[PDB]
Structure 1
Amino acid sequence: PDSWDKDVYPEPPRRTPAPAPQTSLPNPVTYLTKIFDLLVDRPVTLAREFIEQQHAKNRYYYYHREFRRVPDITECEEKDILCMFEAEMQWRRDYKVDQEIVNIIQERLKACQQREGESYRQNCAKELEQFTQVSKAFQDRYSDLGAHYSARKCLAKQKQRMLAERKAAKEAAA
């Protein structure tokens, strides 16, 4: 369906086997499917067609709000309240977007497990690696900030991580 993006929400092509009956007995599943299509599918389709015809007469639109980039806390001077406010708001919006990215990856993982069914341990290894990488990055970003998290705390954590990496690299090179 065109409601979502197939790249963002992939689905492998669906291979449905063709029916190959081997008995003369009638198929109750087929008979009940035909009855269901006759009694339910056609009325709901007619109702939806009427509703969608009504909708097309009053077609109006809504837009996606766009936010421009602003200087971040690394550029903000010390105790410059306006720049700090702008940077904190931008950081919070980026945090929300990252949370939604993690949610998308988790939805991919769940859908792939359910789809593969009995062979999930092997066929879902591709989506498990992406989730592992995304979770690692998200944890390194916002792992232990606390309830009163802020862009300053995230920046201090990043500085600590960078200093630790530099120390490890220097020790290795020594």
Structure 2
Amino acid sequence: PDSWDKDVYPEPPRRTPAPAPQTSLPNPVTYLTKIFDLLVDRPVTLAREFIEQQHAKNRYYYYHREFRRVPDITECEEKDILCMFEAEMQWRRDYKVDQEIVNIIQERLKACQQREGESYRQNCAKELEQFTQVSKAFQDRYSDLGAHYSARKCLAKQKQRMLAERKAAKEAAAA
């Protein structure tokens, strides 16, 4: 429906074949589907129409909270507790958003697997590649912090990684 966005959760155009019967025998699933429709789908549709009519008479809005941008931990003085607190809160919010991004990618991958039936190995390997990139980035971000993680520990891990990368590049330039 119109609830979620079709670009964040994409789907193929849903090609479905037409019924082309080759027998004169009465197909039973068609009759059962018609009976199910007439006996179940109409009362629930009427109930939903009534409930939406009641909802339309009293509608109110809730707003998604928008957070400002505050200085991060890299530009924080060593013993200035207030700026460190703000940076830690911002880093935790970013960590939660990052986890939810990983969740979205994993949901895409699960839809990939289920929808493509038997040929899932080939049809939607693009979702596998996207999940691989996302998982590698998330691992390099928050792999070995452990419990009692903080923005300072993530910064220290990043500094170690950049030092290793710089050393590797300098050694490779001497080849």
* Smaller-chain TM-score bracket: over 0.9
Aligned to 2:84: 84
Q: Which runs of 5+ in 2 are unaligned?
A: none
Q: Deviations over 1:9-32 (max 9, x none)?
A: 001100110000000000100000
Aligned to 2:60: 60
Q: Which runs of 5+ in 1 are unaligned?
A: none
Shift of 1:56: 0.4
Distance 2:74 2:161 in 1: 16
Distance 1:147 1:117 in 2: 40
Q: Deviations over 1:140-173 (max 9, x none)?
A: 0000001010000000000000000000000044
Shift of 1:101: 0.1
TM-score by length of 1: 0.99
Distance 1:151 1:138 in 2: 15
Bigger shift: 59-68 or 164-173?
Answer: 164-173
Shift of 1:117: 1.0
Bigger shift: 164-173 or 21-30?
Answer: 164-173
Aligned to 1:129: 129
SS in 2 for 1:122: helix
Question: Could you say what the CA RMSD is over the residues aligned between the two structures, in angstroms?
Answer: 0.7
Distance 2:10 2:174 in 1: 44
Shift of 1:124: 1.6
How many residues of Structure 1 are paired with residues of Structure 2 in the alignment?
174
Distance 1:103 1:117 in 2: 22
Q: Deviations over 1:79-131 (max 9, x none)?
A: 11000000000000000000000000000000011000100000121000000
Q: Deviations over 1:50-71 (max 9, x none)?
A: 0000000000000000001100
TM-score by length of 2: 0.98
| Percent identity over paired residues | 100
Structure 1 segments (4+ residues) deviating >3 Å: none
